[PDB]
Nucleic acid binder design. Structure first.
Lengths: 70, 76, 75, 72, 72, 76, 73, 65
DNA sequence: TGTGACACGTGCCTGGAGACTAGGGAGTAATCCCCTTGGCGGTTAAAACGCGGGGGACAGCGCGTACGTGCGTTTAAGCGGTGCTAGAGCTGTCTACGACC
DNA sequence: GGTCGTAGACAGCTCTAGCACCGCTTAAACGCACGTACGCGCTGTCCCCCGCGTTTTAACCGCCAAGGGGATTACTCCCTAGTCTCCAGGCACGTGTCACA
């Protein structure tokens, strides 16, 4: 329930780096959902890899290996 | 420059991990790398949606553009 | 189950190959697999192009549609 | 013009297999160019694999590995 | 293990001075190690794919040569 | 001429990368030597381009910005 | 964008200085001008990248020299 | 070659500022590039046995440069 | 076990969250026309279907042959510190310099 | 061609991060020997690949009538970005608690 931590100005600035000129008012919810899906995928892959690595935590290299499979 | 504030992103990552599987530890380096990758992915997605919007004879990006870019890239 | 005529596709593949290296033979199964792959690739590209066209309130597909589909597909 | 064997109705059949309902005139030329690029890449990879294996013909494995390189 | 650090700092300094560089920043070493790992991963992936195509178990010189040819 | 990277660490790194890709793979010594020469030549060329970029910027000390610029120009 | 008349004049001049008794059609010069546009926009983007890397906005001859030297010329 | 065309190309390429000698250098590099591409096209035409350089000759020259 | 890695209470600027508003642009539609596409009829220019030679894929058999591993050890080279300083990021200017007709 | 706002090298200017200098260490490597499993062809075989040859399928060409795209433009009209004002974090700063080979 903390996905709202991705504030409207954050999404607006992220689109601003992407060359976007104007943003509709419904982009924010869709972008929050897309971020939830992408972080779920990456976190699940990293967690699976780090359980396969016989560790109870997750490291930066675990995330790098998870992203390499994206 | 990171455009997502560190604390809310950390809270979101920890919440996602807790919902998926409790008793997991995240450190600053892993969260920073994940946030950088997430920001790069979102910038790429928004570039693609801007391309779609410009193709649609439009400048304001609407969720139609987001869904189009996601489904063409194969993520959906 | 194939949409491109087999013999002209054989001719085109052999033309490209002889442009690459001369006096190269082709297994019939190799050409068949290559044609199936090309058909699948174009079917996917046309699916994405139709998606772009219906997104832009259009039915007719235009070279802009294929260019956009390739551009946001990574090609 | 050895690529004209990929005829206009062939591209129409491919598009209608892809769900397209109406096709503009320049789509045929654009699709012909796109397929020429794709075939050039895949055949280049396949002939490179064949040269690596010291053979004078391209077999199914060479094409499969070329498509694997292309990401199919 | 984290064996990319096995590329010693003096080795990178010698490689740079071979290219004519007169001063090396401290952050050059990590970026160079990352770039070298990326290039080596690409070339090794190509060589492994070529070896798998040849139905072999040992990556010979031909596989590495063809991997280099395929990339630049 | 003579190699600049120590042989054994590079052999171990190459074998580790291969194990990451395909396990239980044997390497011919000539193949590893060719990989060593290729990596040395690539790094020498990259550092030459980086030095050119840095000297253009009125500075001698090359910085990761120079390497990034050289890689972007070369298409990497 | 490049006008077709000066481009045709330049290609005719370079053909005269390289191999005379040669004729170019509209499609050939159109392809040449498209290639020219792509090459020049790429070169200018590379020189601009060098310029921002150089803490300057003007694209002097030095940026052209860099983009030519690094790319393989 | 005209200065305004070079300016349009630079603007399309993301250029914000333009120097003085850059026009002459651009003309020179364009002449060299055209010399190379025409040499490749002539070589292919001599290999392809044609009277005049065609569009497919140009495409082949670019793709096998 | 010693050394290392997280969690909770604060002040404050900083960024985000309520509205207000004036435009910029999204959306729907009426022609419209006209400009393509689709579809249909006739036709022909091909593709798809049967024999031959032999080029080379493919299988079996080695056989030196080179990889993996397994030491002895020792010295060139790497890693910790310092000593020292040319060099990088940051200022003011004036001729050199690029934008508007 | 002209007339009007900006700036790159020079000179400091200061801190600094990098180049030696050096002691201590250490593992790369040169050598030696071994097991053996895979590379590299040898040799033989025959699969099918290329090259020629007759018939429906279909691709081209052309014409005609429906349709839909680009465009203008009414035509409101929706609602986003800029602005204004008010309210929730964020990094140091501590103080305390849990993990690992």
């Amino acid at each position: 329930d903390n996905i709202q931590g991705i504030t409207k100005p954050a999404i607006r600035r992220l689109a601003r780096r992407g060359g976007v000129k104007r943003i509709s008012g419904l982009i924010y919810e869709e972008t929050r959902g897309v971020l939830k899906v992408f972080l779920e995928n990456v976190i699940r892959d990293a967690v699976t890899y780090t359980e396969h690595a016989k560790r109870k935590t997750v490291t930066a290299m675990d995330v790098v290996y998870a992203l390499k499979r994206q | 420059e990171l455009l997502i504030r560190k604390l809310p992103f950390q809270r979101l990552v920890r919440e996602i991990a807790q919902d998926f599987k409790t008793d997991l530890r995240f450190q600053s380096s892993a969260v920073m790398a994940l946030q950088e990758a997430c920001e790069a992915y979102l910038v790429g997605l928004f570039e693609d949606t801007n391309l779609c919007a410009i193709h649609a004879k439009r400048v304001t990006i609407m969720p139609k553009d987001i869904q189009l870019a996601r489904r063409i890239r194969g993520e959906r």
